Design a binder for this molecule. Structure first.
Ligand SMILES: N=C1N[C@H]2[C@H](CS[C@H]2CCCCC(=O)O)N1
Ligand SMILES: N=C1N[C@H]2[C@H](CS[C@H]2CCCCC(=O)O)N1
Ligand SMILES: N=C1N[C@H]2[C@H](CS[C@H]2CCCCC(=O)O)N1
Ligand SMILES: N=C1N[C@H]2[C@H](CS[C@H]2CCCCC(=O)O)N1
Lengths: 122, 121, 122, 121
């Protein structure tokens, strides 16, 4: 539901996610991280299922943030993959991959994996 | 480095990725998978580092595809995270996460993980 | 601390983990899952850091379960990777990979990824 | 199928894996990594499906290495999960998770993920 996803959300680390869900399945917005080599807001883009199943199944979605803005550049990018569950306590449960640019010899250790849960603010 | 990402890429499964990289960090294009509950092309959007390091490091990037188009709807989405390495034989090395919409009872088995390598051949 | 890890633990899905930590860094025990194509107990084996850092860092560890016992065989195996944090509320936080045996053509979809948090029972 | 797992295997990085597969599902041996905060050999233990399916499916397995031995202690552990495929050129295809001990404040960046392919060459 675009109106379900659209809004301001926060995760367990204190980071902010502001997103707008479009009728064509597009997601656009900004992300502010509470941790890492990051400062201020960064641009995010993604996609979601705009015609989900009418049962109690979640809405699949995903988005990306490249950690470069006009103030800092960490030479890394993160992608979040998960689903939106709406209702009184709507949540977006995700798993993420954070890849840093490295030399070919240090590539084996270029990707971190984790999970974040977002709660929507009214 | 830079521009080199724009083009048509293919992975080991035979899927096709057509992308345009914008000067300020955006990635836009279409994806066609050779496997799965998919048929024809789907829209993709992502981001990449438009000012990478000057030592011999790769260019970090990522993108997403929601598997719904005029033909089918698989009620799932995949995100690829990796880095671009240019040179005589450029490649994009990635790891991906594919999440399907499920009921809460099946949420523990909603996400698949894999890796894909793309080249221009 | 072998005495810290050794014990009975439960995760958020209602599954049971019984383990013994050895002086040489070995982990042995049984696992009972609340979900999936599984029934009864399964054998588990793993390793942990038996000489961790003396600061507030966790103790790294990991273990594996192949889902075959004398009653059922699901032709799959799971590995849990994480760390032990002790104190009053001791927890083992993990991320896991579940791989199923498949034909080469369906290999791209052979592995699931998730996370489990275990609480120790007294 | 079966016995074929016992032996010496090498991955793309040049690391060496020496394992013994027991009739009832156990895996035991040593590992030597070519990269990282490691030197010499380390002990490994795991499990595999000792009765796989009869169609053309692979054999599921997994194993763990805590990176402490008489020489160094990196305060980390890695687990590999994958499947064994036998034939003229057998391989073990895996995805791994490497967790380092951290303070709670750094727990968000404690785990690395990757993939390794092992062959007997
Ligand atoms: N809100 C979150 N912040 C961290 C995790 C996933 S992305 C990460 C921040 C990384 C900042 C950039 C970097 O350090 O390379 N969730
Ligand atoms: N080119 C690729 N195809 C599969 C992997 C990751 S995404 C996946 C296709 C999934 C199609 C939709 C579905 O089956 O749910 N790479
Ligand atoms: N306690 C847990 N059970 C599920 C997750 C990870 S392992 C999994 C059970 C899988 C059972 C075997 C199968 O269905 O293939 N945690
Ligand atoms: N053969 C491999 N070596 C690296 C990857 C996964 S485990 C890793 C070596 C880590 C060594 C200890 C460390 O650096 O913490 N595969």
């Amino acid at each position: 539901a675009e109106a379900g996803i659209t809004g301001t959300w926060y995760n367990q680390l204190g980071s902010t996610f502001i997103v707008t869900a479009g009728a064509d399945g597009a997601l656009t917005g900004t992300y502010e991280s509470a941790v890492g080599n990051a400062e201020s807001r960064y641009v995010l883009t993604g996609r979601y299922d705009s015609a989900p199943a009418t049962d109690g199944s979640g809405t699949a979605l995903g988005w990306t943030v490249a950690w470069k803005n006009n103030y800092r550049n960490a030479h890394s990018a993160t992608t979040w993959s998960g689903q939106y569950v709406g209702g009184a306590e709507a949540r977006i449960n995700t798993q993420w991959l954070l890849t840093s640019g490295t030399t070919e010899a240090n590539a084996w250790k270029s990707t971190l994996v984790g999970h974040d849960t977002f709660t929507k603010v009214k």
